Ligand binder design. Sequence first.
Ligand SMILES: Nc1ncnc2c1ncn2[C@@H]1O[C@H](CSCC[C@H](N)C(=O)O)[C@@H](O)[C@H]1O
Ligand SMILES: CCCCCCCCCCCCCCCC[N+](C)(C)C
Length: 285
Amino acid sequence: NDLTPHFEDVQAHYDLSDDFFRLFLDPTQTYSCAHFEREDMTLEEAQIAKIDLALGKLGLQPGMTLLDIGCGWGATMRRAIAQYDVNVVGLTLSKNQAAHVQKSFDEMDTPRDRRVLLAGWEQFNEPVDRIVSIGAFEHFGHDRHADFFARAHKILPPDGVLLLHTITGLTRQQMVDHGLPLTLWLARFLKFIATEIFPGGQPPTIEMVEEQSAKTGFTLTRRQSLQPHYARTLDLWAEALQEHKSEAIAIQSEEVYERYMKYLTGCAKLFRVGYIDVNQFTLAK
Ligand SMILES: Nc1ncnc2c1ncn2[C@@H]1O[C@H](CSCC[C@H](N)C(=O)O)[C@@H](O)[C@H]1O
Ligand SMILES: CCCCCCCCCCCCCCCC[N+](C)(C)C
């Protein structure tokens, strides 16, 4: 009981319009920090790289069941099937993403089991072999971190692994350590994000993830930062949207166009300056 998913807040963003998101996301519609392993790698190649990077840390074996909490448009799961031959289960609070993932699953010609549920992790209690979550944690809310890890720990096998990929904000002290000032623009931009882009969005700090996951019984076998990659990922998304300005205005409006350009370019500065980080936490039971 209780802890019912924050559908409205999350949907206010991801259910805007698939057509709109298609204007700037790479073809796989991955919506999270990419990983440019080769300097001249395209956004799609870098997104696939980030996918494989996360998946390869799980120790996936044929026949296992992989749970993707906050699966987005399903590229990660579809890639997990082809590259690791595992069955997949995806959770998302986005109606458009659920419909899209389902459709894409139907069009796949694989024997592996695959389904997507319009539900939060808080509503999922099925046993699974491994868990991947990329860019979803930031939406969970600090007040639910503890319960999140408890559930992940509960549904994973005794030697299960959780790959938690999430944006992390520097503590106030870390910012001071890095000589990053608390400017009016920063506070203003953050309020903007929370008000017009990601309501309910509360990125954790690094220590929050470590401490909370440790309390549950997870061991952090590795934390890997992709900070420099997000600024670039963000620039590419911003540029694509800008290249589709007229299409964006047609599908939505100039207001929405400008809102997203403001959000995309603004965040690119956050990572570029270093106010925000993005990390992959390999958590083992
Ligand atoms: N409590 C919750 N339970 C399950 N999914 C959640 C959630 N809060 C947010 N999400 C999901 O997390 C995703 C954030 S967007 C990231 C999508 C995908 N993992 C990718 O990397 O491209 C959305 O699919 C959103 O619906
Ligand atoms: C690309 C998004 C960058 C957000 C940077 C930090 C801004 C302030 C905190 C907002 C928290 C919400 C994060 C939602 C992340 C959603 N996506 C995974 C799809 C990018």
